């Protein structure tokens, strides 16, 4: 075998009659999953990987983008300057995992070290005919959903002496959030996240550590986003179809070491108008829905990014990143790289 | 190499390419490595610079590899070395900001001196030289004067403010009557 590039298939357990929008979308465009995939471990072979140079994650891009292009209707889009309209029904929306497949002539390499970070040689590689089910949940700051490092936290970056290079942290244990729009509900498009104060806490401390490690005699705190767009700024992410905008500050706040309620508490804003980010544009919704919107989730990554600079002060802080859908799903196809045998 | 004139308040524009490509990552740091502006996909991310609520960018532009460094309300402090980095490159563009304000009152008359002061960054030495109403130009250095105003010292006062040749003009109005 040699490293490749090929058209890949997707594979779901969509279901063909739900109105779902993630399940209609796969029913078409993908295989069912294969209730026994095939596993094939590689005795003696090391292979090198390189997650950032990935053309995987490039087509897992291309079909969220076509995905989100054929469920969520805007009913004003604007694109070349050119705005136009349609109708914009409310929709039922709710991610699926989606599998990504090698056709004849082609494998996948997976990657089992519980140490690999992205880059260099692999020892335990095996060969799938498939990913694991990848929910492709679009979001800045947090990464929602995904699977877990297995043995301890992980960092990965492009490059981590490059302060614009995004920081995936894989966390290896999970903290909940939920986050909901009540039913009266005042302001029908106010909403509030909250997230177990001690677990976040505990998980603060042990990336700071990890953090720490690659940044030697280095303090290491954590702060708010540092602007831009409001989608980058706070937590963004849509729920049951709304776009949801959640402030982060209460989370990224100080430094975090060893040893209000218990519950942190985030407030959110749901919006009609954003920025898009299938590409450069701006999109506007009709107001949210009726009862309560609540979603429910699993924070098991976080997307960071350094402060750095020729600052004689010695202290990394690290930030809230996000918004390049592409290191989303870095995070969980970083082990998958498409082979020609 | 290349040295951009601004003055306090306005609003200035430093431009960046990609080599003749389409819509990729690029970032903007001063001299001191801080992040300014750059972009995450589709969006536009600031870093933890000075400028932050003033920096913008022309995201329209950005699928013909434009990337310009939009600085609004233009400070002194805003003076610096700027790096655009995209795809290897790293290009370099110098800003320097100047103000020229008149540390008097407004309403002035008789015999009273008249102070115009040039606001400038510690990267600057530039000349400075102001026309008055009558034609008459006062050439100085970072503080330059009139030793007794007059009557028709008053009205629209031209100043030029010369740097790498290359020049910036603060048109000033004084009253004296
Ligand atoms: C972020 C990080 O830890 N990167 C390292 C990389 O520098 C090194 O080349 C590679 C070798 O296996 O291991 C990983
Ligand atoms: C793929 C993934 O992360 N799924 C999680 C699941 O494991 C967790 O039990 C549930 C409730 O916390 O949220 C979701
Ligand atoms: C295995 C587990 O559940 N949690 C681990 C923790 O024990 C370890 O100290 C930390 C270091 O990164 O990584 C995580
Ligand atoms: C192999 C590689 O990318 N090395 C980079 C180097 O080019 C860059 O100047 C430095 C600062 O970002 O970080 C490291
Ligand atoms: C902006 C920043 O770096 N940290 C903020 C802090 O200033 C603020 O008091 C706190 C309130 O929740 O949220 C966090
Ligand atoms: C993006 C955004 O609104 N961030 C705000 C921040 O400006 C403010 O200082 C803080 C205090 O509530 O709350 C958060
Ligand atoms: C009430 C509470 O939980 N306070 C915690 C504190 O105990 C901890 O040392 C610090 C850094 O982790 O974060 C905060
Ligand atoms: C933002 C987002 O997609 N959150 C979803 C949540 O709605 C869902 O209930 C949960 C478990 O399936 O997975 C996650």
Redesign the interface.
């Known amino acids: 075998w040699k490293g490749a590039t090929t058209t890949l298939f997707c594979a779901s357990d969509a279901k063909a009659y739900e109105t779902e929008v993630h399940n209609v979308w796969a029913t078409h465009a993908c295989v069912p999953a294969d209730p026994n995939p095939q596993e094939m471990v590689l005795e003696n072979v090391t292979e090198n990987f390189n997650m950032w140079k990935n053309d995987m994650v490039n087509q897992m891009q291309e079909d969220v983008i076509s995905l989100w292009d054929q469920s969520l209707k805007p009913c004003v889009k604007l694109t070349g300057?050119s705005a136009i309209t349609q109708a914009c029904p409310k929709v039922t929306f709710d991610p699926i995992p989606i599998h990504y497949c090698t056709p004849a002539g082609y494998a996948i390499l997976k990657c089992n070290d519980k140490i690999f970070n992205g880059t260099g040689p692999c020892h335990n590689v095996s060969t799938v005919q498939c990913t694991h089910g990848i929910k492709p949940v679009v979001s800045?700051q947090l990464l929602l959903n995904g699977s877990l490092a297995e043995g301890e936290i992980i960092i990965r970056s492009e490059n981590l002496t490059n302060?614009?290079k995004?920081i995936i942290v894989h966390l290896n244990q999970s903290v909940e959030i939920v986050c909901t729009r009540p039913g009266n509900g005042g302001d029908i498009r106010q909403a509030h996240c909250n997230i177990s104060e001690d677990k976040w806490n505990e998980t603060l401390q042990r990336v700071s550590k990890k953090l720490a490690e690659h940044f030697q005699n280095k303090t290491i705190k954590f702060?708010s986003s540092?602007?831009?767009?409001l989608?980058?700024t706070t937590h963004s992410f849509n729920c049951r179809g709304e776009f949801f905008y959640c402030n982060t500050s209460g989370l990224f706040n100080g430094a975090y070491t060893p040893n209000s309620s218990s519950i942190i508490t985030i407030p959110c804003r749901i919006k009609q108008i954003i920025?898009?980010?299938?590409?450069?544009?701006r999109a506007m919704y009709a107001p949210p829905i009726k009862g309560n919107i609540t979603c429910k989730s699993n924070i098991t990554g976080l997307l960071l990014?350094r402060?750095?600079?020729?600052?004689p002060n010695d202290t990394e802080?690290f930030?809230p990143?996000?918004?390049?859908?592409?290191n989303n799903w870095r995070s969980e196809l970083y082990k998958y790289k498409v082979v020609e045998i | 190499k290349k040295v951009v004139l601004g003055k306090k308040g306005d609003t200035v524009e430093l431009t960046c390419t990609a080599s003749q490509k389409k819509?990729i990552?690029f970032?903007w740091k001063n001299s001191?490595?801080?992040?300014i502006?750059?972009?995450?996909?589709?969006?536009?991310?600031?870093?933890?610079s000075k400028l932050?609520?003033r920096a913008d960018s022309r995201?329209?532009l950005?699928?013909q590899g434009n990337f310009p460094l939009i600085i609004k309300n233009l400070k002194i402090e805003d003076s610096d070395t700027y790096i655009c980095?995209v795809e290897d490159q790293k290009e370099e563009v110098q800003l320097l900001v100047f103000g020229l304000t008149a540390n008097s009152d407004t309403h002035l008359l008789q015999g009273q001196s008249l102070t115009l002061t040039l606001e400038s960054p510690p990267g600057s030495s530039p000349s400075v030289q102001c026309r008055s109403p009558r034609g008459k130009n006062i050439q100085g250095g970072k503080t330059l004067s009139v030793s007794q105003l007059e009557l028709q010292d008053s009205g629209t006062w031209t100043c030029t403010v010369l740097q790498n040749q290359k020049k910036v003009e603060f048109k000033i109005d004084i009253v004296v009557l």
Not at chain 1, 321 to 326: F, L
Not at chain 2, 37 to 48: E, H, R
């Open positions: 300057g800045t302060n614009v995004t702060a540092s602007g831009g767009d989608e980058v920025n898009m980010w299938q590409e450069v544009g990014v402060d750095g600079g020729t600052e802080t930030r990143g996000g918004g390049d859908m592409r | 819509s990552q970032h001191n490595q801080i992040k502006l750059g972009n995450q996909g589709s969006f536009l991310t600031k870093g933890p932050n609520d995201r329209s950005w699928d980095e």
